[PDB]
Design an enzyme around this catalytic site. Structure first.
Site, PDB file in Angstrom:
ATOM      1  N   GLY B  10       0.813  -1.218   0.000  1.00  0.00           N
ATOM      2  CA  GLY B  10       0.000   0.000   0.000  1.00  0.00           C
ATOM      3  C   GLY B  10       0.839   1.257   0.000  1.00  0.00           C
ATOM      4  N   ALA B  12       1.446   3.816   2.241  1.00  0.00           N
ATOM      5  CA  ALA B  12       2.309   4.065   3.389  1.00  0.00           C
ATOM      6  C   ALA B  12       3.529   3.161   3.344  1.00  0.00           C
ATOM      7  CB  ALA B  12       1.543   3.868   4.691  1.00  0.00           C
ATOM      8  N   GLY B 136      -5.340   2.058   5.688  1.00  0.00           N
ATOM      9  CA  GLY B 136      -5.770   1.872   4.303  1.00  0.00           C
ATOM     10  C   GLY B 136      -6.336   0.488   4.099  1.00  0.00           C
ATOM     11  N   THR B 138      -5.596  -1.542   1.544  1.00  0.00           N
ATOM     12  CA  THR B 138      -4.533  -2.439   1.064  1.00  0.00           C
ATOM     13  C   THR B 138      -3.600  -2.746   2.243  1.00  0.00           C
ATOM     14  OG1 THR B 138      -4.700  -1.643  -1.193  1.00  0.00           O
ATOM     15  CG2 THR B 138      -2.605  -2.740  -0.603  1.00  0.00           C
ATOM     16  N   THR B 172      -7.010   9.713   6.134  1.00  0.00           N
ATOM     17  CA  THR B 172      -7.775   9.883   4.885  1.00  0.00           C
ATOM     18  C   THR B 172      -9.130   9.166   4.892  1.00  0.00           C
ATOM     19  OG1 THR B 172      -5.965   8.542   3.906  1.00  0.00           O
ATOM     20  CG2 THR B 172      -6.241  10.832   3.118  1.00  0.00           C
ATOM     21  N   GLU B 176     -10.704   4.147   9.370  1.00  0.00           N
ATOM     22  CA  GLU B 176      -9.387   3.656   9.828  1.00  0.00           C
ATOM     23  C   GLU B 176      -9.414   2.809  11.113  1.00  0.00           C
ATOM     24  OE1 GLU B 176      -6.897   6.920   7.175  1.00  0.00           O
ATOM     25  OE2 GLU B 176      -5.790   5.911   8.792  1.00  0.00           O
ATOM     26  N   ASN B 199       1.477   7.907  13.654  1.00  0.00           N
ATOM     27  CA  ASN B 199       1.636   9.104  12.827  1.00  0.00           C
ATOM     28  C   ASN B 199       1.571  10.430  13.606  1.00  0.00           C
ATOM     29  OD1 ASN B 199       2.530   8.335  10.245  1.00  0.00           O
ATOM     30  ND2 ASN B 199       0.503   8.440   9.298  1.00  0.00           N
ATOM     31  N   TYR B 217       4.149  13.741   4.374  1.00  0.00           N
ATOM     32  CA  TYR B 217       4.576  12.342   4.386  1.00  0.00           C
ATOM     33  C   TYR B 217       6.085  12.220   4.154  1.00  0.00           C
ATOM     34  CZ  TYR B 217      -0.296  10.631   4.367  1.00  0.00           C
ATOM     35  OH  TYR B 217      -1.608  10.348   4.659  1.00  0.00           O
ATOM     36  N   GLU B 247      16.631 -12.988  17.110  1.00  0.00           N
ATOM     37  CA  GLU B 247      17.131 -12.295  18.282  1.00  0.00           C
ATOM     38  C   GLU B 247      16.205 -11.137  18.722  1.00  0.00           C
ATOM     39  OE1 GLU B 247      21.375 -11.286  18.224  1.00  0.00           O
ATOM     40  OE2 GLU B 247      20.917 -10.099  20.032  1.00  0.00           O
TER      41      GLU B 247
HETATM   42  N1  LIG Z   1       3.720   7.792   7.794  1.00  0.00           N
HETATM   43  C1  LIG Z   1       3.041   7.676   6.620  1.00  0.00           C
HETATM   44  N2  LIG Z   1       1.733   7.392   6.625  1.00  0.00           N
HETATM   45  C2  LIG Z   1       1.056   7.269   5.453  1.00  0.00           C
HETATM   46  C3  LIG Z   1       1.681   7.503   4.202  1.00  0.00           C
HETATM   47  N3  LIG Z   1       0.728   7.305   3.240  1.00  0.00           N
HETATM   48  C4  LIG Z   1      -0.409   7.022   3.811  1.00  0.00           C
HETATM   49  N4  LIG Z   1      -0.246   6.971   5.185  1.00  0.00           N
HETATM   50  C5  LIG Z   1      -1.209   6.722   6.221  1.00  0.00           C
HETATM   51  O1  LIG Z   1      -1.786   5.425   5.998  1.00  0.00           O
HETATM   52  C6  LIG Z   1      -3.275   5.539   6.063  1.00  0.00           C
HETATM   53  C7  LIG Z   1      -3.880   5.485   4.701  1.00  0.00           C
HETATM   54  O2  LIG Z   1      -3.555   4.193   4.269  1.00  0.00           O
HETATM   55  P1  LIG Z   1      -2.744   4.027   2.841  1.00  0.00           P
HETATM   56  O3  LIG Z   1      -1.390   3.307   2.954  1.00  0.00           O
HETATM   57  O4  LIG Z   1      -2.602   5.355   2.138  1.00  0.00           O
HETATM   58  O5  LIG Z   1      -3.814   3.202   1.919  1.00  0.00           O
HETATM   59  P2  LIG Z   1      -3.455   1.857   1.084  1.00  0.00           P
HETATM   60  O6  LIG Z   1      -2.667   0.800   1.868  1.00  0.00           O
HETATM   61  O7  LIG Z   1      -2.765   2.175  -0.204  1.00  0.00           O
HETATM   62  O8  LIG Z   1      -4.926   1.228   0.898  1.00  0.00           O
HETATM   63  P3  LIG Z   1      -6.035   1.720  -0.210  1.00  0.00           P
HETATM   64  O9  LIG Z   1      -5.625   2.950  -0.892  1.00  0.00           O
HETATM   65  O10 LIG Z   1      -7.362   1.881   0.584  1.00  0.00           O
HETATM   66  O11 LIG Z   1      -6.074   0.526  -1.226  1.00  0.00           O
HETATM   67  C8  LIG Z   1      -3.582   6.919   6.742  1.00  0.00           C
HETATM   68  O12 LIG Z   1      -3.372   6.728   8.146  1.00  0.00           O
HETATM   69  C9  LIG Z   1      -2.408   7.732   6.205  1.00  0.00           C
HETATM   70  O13 LIG Z   1      -2.109   8.813   7.053  1.00  0.00           O
HETATM   71  C10 LIG Z   1       3.108   7.768   4.222  1.00  0.00           C
HETATM   72  O14 LIG Z   1       3.790   7.945   3.208  1.00  0.00           O
HETATM   73  N5  LIG Z   1       3.735   7.849   5.452  1.00  0.00           N
END
Ligand SMILES: Nc1nc2c(ncn2[C@@H]2O[C@H](COP(=O)(O)OP(=O)(O)OP(=O)(O)O)[C@@H](O)[C@H]2O)c(=O)[nH]1
Ligand SMILES: Nc1nc2c(ncn2[C@@H]2O[C@H](COP(=O)(O)OP(=O)(O)OP(=O)(O)O)[C@@H](O)[C@H]2O)c(=O)[nH]1
Ligand SMILES: Nc1nc2c(ncn2[C@@H]2O[C@H](COP(=O)(O)OP(=O)(O)OP(=O)(O)O)[C@@H](O)[C@H]2O)c(=O)[nH]1
Ligand SMILES: Nc1nc2c(ncn2[C@@H]2O[C@H](COP(=O)(O)OP(=O)(O)O)[C@@H](O)[C@H]2O)c(=O)[nH]1
Ligand SMILES: [Mg+2]
Ligand SMILES: [Mg+2]
Ligand SMILES: [Mg+2]
Lengths: 136, 431, 432, 431, 431
Positions: B10, B12, B136, B138, B172, B176, B199, B217, B247
């Site tokens: 995903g 993040a 998210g 994913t 987003t 969540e 976060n 981000y 470990e």
């Molecule tokens: N620290 C950090 N958090 C992130 C980033 N991108 C998204 N998030 C966080 O992750 C969550 C959103 O999930 P995502 O990873 O964007 O969504 P995904 O896994 O791609 O899932 P879908 O888009 O629904 O298929 C929210 O809490 C965002 O703030 C990143 O680059 N860094």
């Protein structure tokens, strides 16, 4: 003042050791399921897919019922218009025939009245003939 | 040789992966094209090709192509081979059920096939490092699906997580908390050790220590990568502590379910600031016992320690470490559970802390990452569980999960498992 | 989730739709010939959401223009951006709907529906990743209302896994063009509750009131109303057509906005409010933009948001401004107005900031609320429906099309259940 | 495309038709030979291969005199001979001779001609039927034709332009009988009927046009103007258009309540030059004043159920809405409580055209209001009362009975009129 | 409705008929040879109603001249317009009827009837659109009365759907000493009640009284009386003879004038009253014509119209005058004299204006009234009939011809029922 230092490891880019401030107050270390199965995972994913597919099919069954109702309303309007035509056609034929019958009856009654006048006239002529010649 | 495979799931997970792999390359002197003008330990994370190029032992997965499309067009496009960057077309729309049950089912075999090809190149595979968000669809849905299959294919092979815990400042999706609890329940018995990254904690460190008014981000990820680098340094260099993935578990996890260590990092100093005197070992060690430097918001005073690891980096001497630990114990309780000794496992990795040139962090002579397994982390689960309860009592948004084939009973099952987890943290700290 | 397929049905649908295409073409730097003449890569990043790229440098709206009457189609072609549309995408009948929902839904509409679906299928099958559909229509007439909802149901059947989105214009006696608007709106609402995923409730009552009361326009025209509609449509679509994190596609927007399937009727808000002629204006700060969230005067639906509670809110800020100031101002409004947000949906307000302001303004704000106060709009329509229905007034025009009285009773009952459902969540407590 | 077939029955219908078709030709620039040097006029005129434009109309009369003038007059080349249908003997002011005795001889021929006109239509909207209430042909032949059209065309829209009798210009003592019999028989066959009271028109000509003794030529030019206003929405493409179906939907709340009141403004004499130009507000206000009405009745004593405003010339929507809003604030103009919105608007660009050497002045803007008011029931009451006076003595009844009609038909027709008066009363009551 | 077939029977019938043909030939510009020498298209427009067009420029009266006595035929041929008649249309017997209705109806008349029908059938079958028949005769004699009514029944049998109209001259002791005139008149009235559609009651009592009292003619002749008859006949046929809207044909006149089948006896009236071939040079005004035409002194039937009520009235004005003035004067007379018009026949007075005045006058008015006061004429005949019948005086004159007393009783009873019927409608109220 007391601290126990136990050297652990020494390597090329590191060194490690354990610092003990107090031993555990409670001695005797602490006071599971398998596996899972690929079959068990597949069964659950297939069951969820069957639920998703069943609900989409139900949505489609209901949309098809709407298509059926749509055809039924179109048909109802066709039928009502057809019965309207049939009703007007018979009401009009009955009215035109009843009017024909009545008008021809009025014309027949008046011609029969005039025909009786002719019968009376020949009877008058008869009387005059009985009086004339057959006297004097 | 003891290879570690990294899995980025995903947005993040992928974006944190970009930051981690950029930092690893700077640390090992690997250029963005995979070339290095060559202590052998970097081989645990990078394989080598016939053209003398160094390739990350990693897989990047997303259900949508946008984020990974940037990796395949960006500065590091030559670092990764196309087959290790896997994308679908349609994402999980912030829906765990969609990521796990609907879309996930389409790409799972392809991901496992790529993972298998990477594992085939390993002579002593240690296991997997899985990077993902809780929030998210994913990051939540696909990750738990992947973790379950990995336990089947690689039985009793180590799996560690770097999980992004949600914060409303950057969230987003309203859903969540649902996705977070659903993924935690499903992944629990499959993960050996998981490092949560709140976060909000990262957002606050960026605002306070880095003077960033509105952290992005990019700011969050650079800071996250420094902690990931601290944790992985002794796998990638010839270190003495946390030498193998097994470990981490031995040193920090006394019970299988209570496997969520708290990371505390220091120092975090702004690059665009006036010349200053370098922080001593005492100062950075003191910073380890300050809730403001934590990677998860919680109060260690409201818990008990069951294991503590201090990972020093750079110009650090054992004599200065021991004196720093001795002064702390005199002024602070640092309460451990009855069954564990009150102590620390300390590791010094001589490799200097590294920063991205032109980044927000100042380059420092010495840094430290403390990994502690405290019962105080249960506070992060309670905050998430409460938000879940509020919405779930009304079945708000539940129809989105049910529509994807999930059963309402799964929400109850996941929540009951979280209630047992909170109860475990309580029971573990009792005496 | 890339392409959106846009459908414009009836007079209102086509007028509001044409305005949407001219406003968004100007924002994306597209001229009336389809050529990009802008000066920003952000304008083209997500161009494919609304435009197909044709032979050469040209961009063509993925828009289908529908009417049972030919006149409206001519008026569109003759308009400023009239030539941008695909000529084969104009699907029109020769005999209108006579402002009769039954003619639009069952008779004349049914006769034209397949010609429309063939054009929508051509556009849909060309899509790499179809998000779904966006329909602009009124609920008060015959075509947009009856045929528009017929299209929705036929589309739901062929694309059951795609998002169905509408911009539905609600009738008002204040700016009315037919006596049977209460019947046509109630019959359409019944269809929308069951068949759309998300509906923007664009109320002519609210638009008239804004023009008369706020803009001080003594005699508002459709031109004055449509200037507010187009500003709203541009604002609510900002997240779909420019790069961003929040509500970037139709499904992510629905997941964040819709807690219960039937409760998918949004109350749009906009600031600053301006008149076509008001080419002034020099104003609007971040605290000023934010305050208009609870301002009933800025609502495009004639409901007072302070009469209900927000289930979910999406807020879009446009122009060059501090994201820090926006975050502070948005948190302040939620904390101060705690009582108008349901406590059982935590963090139910999501904020997005787009650097590109709309034309004429340096700074703007768009609000998308899922409020329990929208029940006031449905109650107003229900009371007008009942005043006519009680006396069976104009009913012969509907039953004459093959409809039964029961469909009227069912539509009315479903709309009243919707009202009752909004009230239930309005009164719910986090006693949990 | 969207065709409308016009049928002109008996003297009144034919003579009004002469005035209407003369005016349409002037409006569209069609010469008396059908030649012409928009596009909407095609709804009323078909085109031949020689570029000649032919009215979509049938003229019928049971006597040849009136139509003989059409076939020898200025517009003899405009109509094809087959569309001008005449018998030899008229209906002698007797509904029974029109409907039965004389009418049954020409009915099939008339339907054959309308069938040929309908065959040339691609989008037939329906029929416009012009006739008097008073004449034997206008009453009896119209009802026969209306019944026969319902058989051949079912529910296809049928609208009337009916001449309501006035003693100032009446030719038969039996006009109230002919009026009631035609109304009863045509009621279930007509969708919408526009009555024109000859006394109202006679008084407008006297009062507004300064005509001492108005003739049919004076009456018909004014009538032609109202008809042209009702039909301009169909014959032109203006700012706001209203088709045949829209008229029924917006003016007819119940099938039997289908008699809108026409009010036209301004009616200015060909002298003065100061008496203009009237504003949109002034002409709109004039529609709610009784002196401009086409039927004598008092709306102040009735309730409005529907109002349609058809503007022509220099008229802007902003001007119209302003005028309708002031009408809305008027306490003296009351609408039924079961009608939340009562207004329907038509706007055409072309100012009203006047016949050269006519009585009417050229105006920049005009309007025709069509309103369904319960006050129109007063026109039925006046007619019903005259019927009752004669019927109580069976005066003149023998003329109808002699033609095969039954007394029961008179009772049935009168009971249906009583139910109609009762319907207007019931409709004006609040719930 | 075009052709009228005229029949002239007996002395009175032929004398009044010959006068009618000379008066109407002069009005239509026809000379004694049949040639049109007029100077107005209005004279020829409806010329076909009374004239057939023969070989060349000639016009021939559609007239049949009948008598049982040859002398009258000779006198007609020798008259001013005698040569205009078709020679084959003179049908004359040799015997005479000797003032005996029975000889005219059953005996001598029956022997001549077929020769007459030969000629009427020829004239009738030549008609494009036969309106019907017009018979002139007296009721006091034998031929005109008995044979005239025999002709009515015979023609009606062959033409049952045509209008039967008469100019019936009523006997008076003031002009004729023939004692049996009441019998002949009563026997004829019985026939007229049943067999005619419309009868103009031309009373010799009224004609004599006008000549003696108004014209100051001490000893009036048939020439003086006939001058009033011809002025009346010209006036009552003006609407049939010239283009116009009102009572333009025999059926439309009957429909407007006859509310009950038996009550078809009209009281004609005329103004100004003049003597033969006398000037002039002082034309009456519209109020004068209006007043004079409704006065007992101007009635051609010896009844006071103020002794009854008008069921229906047709008023015809001739000459150049204001139609506005005529309308005002006519409305004034019916508003002021409300009590002389039945309230249960609304708008029962119809007015026509013809531009062509009769010869010798610039302005004239003709009144046709269906008045309940005509019962005075029938009562006068009935009283004279009963005075004779009570004593069976002269009965053997009729029984000698084959008649029975019962026919006398029946005729008398029928005439008294007619009187009783007029009285019934005189007393009826609208209420
Ligand atoms: N620290 C950090 N958090 C992130 C980033 N991108 C998204 N998030 C966080 O992750 C969550 C959103 O999930 P995502 O990873 O964007 O969504 P995904 O896994 O791609 O899932 P879908 O888009 O629904 O298929 C929210 O809490 C965002 O703030 C990143 O680059 N860094
Ligand atoms: N406005 C108007 N009214 C007319 C005209 N001609 C006749 N009428 C009226 O219509 C009624 C007479 O009916 P007509 O149309 O003349 O008679 P018709 O339909 O030809 O029927 P018949 O002659 O009896 O066969 C009276 O009310 C007349 O005043 C006309 O040209 N204009
Ligand atoms: N006004 C008028 N009355 C006439 C004239 N000639 C005769 N009469 C009247 O007509 C009646 C006499 O009837 P006639 O016409 O002479 O009888 P007829 O038809 O010739 O029948 P017969 O002589 O009996 O065979 C009386 O009432 C006379 O007063 C005439 O020229 N003018
Ligand atoms: N806001 C707005 N409303 C409109 C416009 N045109 C018509 N309407 C409204 O739409 C409804 C009439 O329906 P309309 O779309 O014209 O009928 P249709 O062509 O059969 O679909 C009424 O509520 C009118 O007020 C417009 O341009 N703007
Ligand atoms: Mg994603
Ligand atoms: Mg006529
Ligand atoms: Mg004689």
């Amino acid at each position: 003042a007391d601290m126990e230092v136990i050297e652990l490891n020494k390597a090329t880019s590191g060194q490690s050791w354990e610092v003990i401030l107090k031993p555990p107050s409670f001695d005797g270390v602490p006071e599971r399921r398998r596996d899972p199965s690929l079959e068990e995972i597949q069964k659950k994913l297939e069951a969820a897919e069957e639920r998703r597919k069943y609900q989409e099919a139900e949505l489609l069954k209901h949309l098809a019922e709407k298509r059926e109702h749509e055809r039924e309303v179109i048909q109802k309007a066709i039928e009502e218009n057809n019965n309207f035509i049939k009703m007007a056609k018979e009401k009009l034929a009955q009215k035109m025939e009843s009017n024909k019958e009545n008008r021809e009856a009025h014309l027949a009654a008046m011609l029969e009245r005039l025909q009786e006048k002719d019968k009376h006239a020949e009877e008058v002529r008869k009387n005059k003939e009985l009086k004339e010649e057959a006297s004097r | 040789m003891r290879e570690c495979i990294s899995i980025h799931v995903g947005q993040a997970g992928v974006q944190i992966g970009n930051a981690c792999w950029e930092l690893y390359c700077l640390e090992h002197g690997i250029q963005p094209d995979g070339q290095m003008p060559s202590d052998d330990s970097f081989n645990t994370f990078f394989s080598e090709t016939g053209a003398g190029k160094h390739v990350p032992r990693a897989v990047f997965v997303d259900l949508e192509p946008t984020v990974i499309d940037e990796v395949r067009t960006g500065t590091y496009r030559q670092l990764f081979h196309p087959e290790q960057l896997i994308t679908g077309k349609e994402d999980a729309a912030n829906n765990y059920a969609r990521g796990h049950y609907t879309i996930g089912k389409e790409i799972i075999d392809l991901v496992l096939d790529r993972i298998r090809k990477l594992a085939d190149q390993c002579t002593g595979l240690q296991g997997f490092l899985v990077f993902h968000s809780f929030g998210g669809g994913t990051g939540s849905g696909f990750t738990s699906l992947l973790m379950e299959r990995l336990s089947v294919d690689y039985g009793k092979k180590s799996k560690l997580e770097f999980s992004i815990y949600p914060a409303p400042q950057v969230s987003t999706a309203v859903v969540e908390p649902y996705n977070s609890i659903l993924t935690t329940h499903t992944t629990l018995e499959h993960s050996d050790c998981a490092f949560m990254v709140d976060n909000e904690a990262i957002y606050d460190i960026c605002r306070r220590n880095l003077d960033i008014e509105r952290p992005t981000y990019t700011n969050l990820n650079r800071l996250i990568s420094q902690i990931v680098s601290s944790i992985t340094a002794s796998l990638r260099f010839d270190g003495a502590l946390n030498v193998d993935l097994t470990e981490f578990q031995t040193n920090l996890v006394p019970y299988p379910r209570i496997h969520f260590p708290l990371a505390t990092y220091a120092p975090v100093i702004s690059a665009e600031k006036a010349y200053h005197e370098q922080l001593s070992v005492a100062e950075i060690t003191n910073a380890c016992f300050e809730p403001a430097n934590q990677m998860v918001k919680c109060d260690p005073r409201h818990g008990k320690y069951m294991a503590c690891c201090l990972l020093y980096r750079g110009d650090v001497v054992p004599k200065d470490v021991n004196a720093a630990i001795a002064t702390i114990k005199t002024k602070r309780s640092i309460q451990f559970v009855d069954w564990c000794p009150t102590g620390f496992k300390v590791g010094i990795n001589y490799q200097p802390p590294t920063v991205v040139p032109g980044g927000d962090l100042a380059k420092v002579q010495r840094a430290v990452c403390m990994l502690s397994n405290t019962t105080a982390i249960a506070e992060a689960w309670a905050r998430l569980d409460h938000k879940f309860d509020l919405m779930y009592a009304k079945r708000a948004f539940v129809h989105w999960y049910v529509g994807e084939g999930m059963e309402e009973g799964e929400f109850s099952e996941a929540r009951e498992d979280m209630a047992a987890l909170e109860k475990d943290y309580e029971e573990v700290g009792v005496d | 989730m890339r392409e959106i397929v846009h459908i414009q049905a009836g007079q209102c649908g086509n007028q509001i739709g044409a305005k949407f295409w001219e406003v968004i073409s100007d924002e994306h730097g597209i001229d009336p010939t389809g050529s990009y003449h802008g000066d920003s890569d952000l304008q083209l990043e997500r161009i494919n959401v609304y435009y197909n790229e044709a032979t050469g440098n040209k961009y063509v709206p993925r828009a289908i223009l529908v009417d049972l009457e030919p006149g409206t189609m001519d008026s569109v072609r003759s308009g400023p951006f009239g030539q941008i549309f695909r000529p084969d995408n104009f699907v029109f009948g020769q005999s209108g709907a006579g402002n009769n929902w039954a003619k639009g839904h069952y008779t004349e509409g049914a006769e034209l529906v397949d010609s429309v679906l063939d054009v929508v299928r051509k556009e849909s099958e060309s899509c790499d990743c179809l998000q779904g559909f966006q329909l602009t229509h009124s609920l008060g007439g015959g075509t947009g209302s009856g045929m528009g909802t017929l299209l929705i149901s036929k589309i739901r059947e062929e694309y059951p896994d795609r998002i169905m989105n509408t911009f539905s214009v609600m009738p008002s006696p204040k700016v009315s063009d037919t006596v049977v608007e209460p019947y046509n709106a109630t019959l359409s609402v019944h269809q929308l509750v069951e068949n759309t995923d998300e509906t923007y409730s664009i109320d002519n009552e609210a638009l008239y009131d804004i023009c008369f009361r706020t803009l001080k326009l003594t005699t508002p025209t459709y031109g004055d109303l449509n200037h507010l509609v187009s500003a709203t449509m541009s604002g609510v679509t900002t997240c779909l057509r420019f790069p961003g994190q929040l509500n970037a596609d139709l499904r992510k927007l629905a997941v964040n906005m819709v807690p219960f399937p039937r409760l998918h009727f949004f109350m749009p808000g906009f600031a600053p409010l301006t008149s076509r002629g008001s080419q002034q204006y020099r104003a609007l700060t971040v605290p000023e933009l934010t305050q208009q969230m609870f301002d009933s005067k800025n609502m495009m639906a004639a409901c007072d948001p302070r009469h209900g509670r927000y289930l979910t809110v999406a807020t879009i800020f446009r122009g060059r401004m501090s994201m820090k100031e926006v975050d502070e101002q948005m948190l302040n409004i939620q904390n101060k107005n705690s009582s108008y947000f349901v406590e059982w949906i935590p963090n139910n307000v999501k904020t997005a900031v787009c650097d590109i302001p709309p034309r004429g303004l340096k700074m703007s704000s768009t609000f998308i609320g899922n409020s329990t106060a929208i029940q006031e709009l449905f109650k107003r329509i229900s009371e007008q429906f009942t005043a006519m229905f009680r006396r069976k007034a104009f009913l012969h025009w509907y039953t004459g099309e093959g409809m039964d009285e029961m469909e009227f009773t069912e539509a009315e009952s479903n709309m009243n259940d919707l009202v009752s459902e909004y009230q239930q969540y309005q009164d719910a407590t986090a006693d949990e």
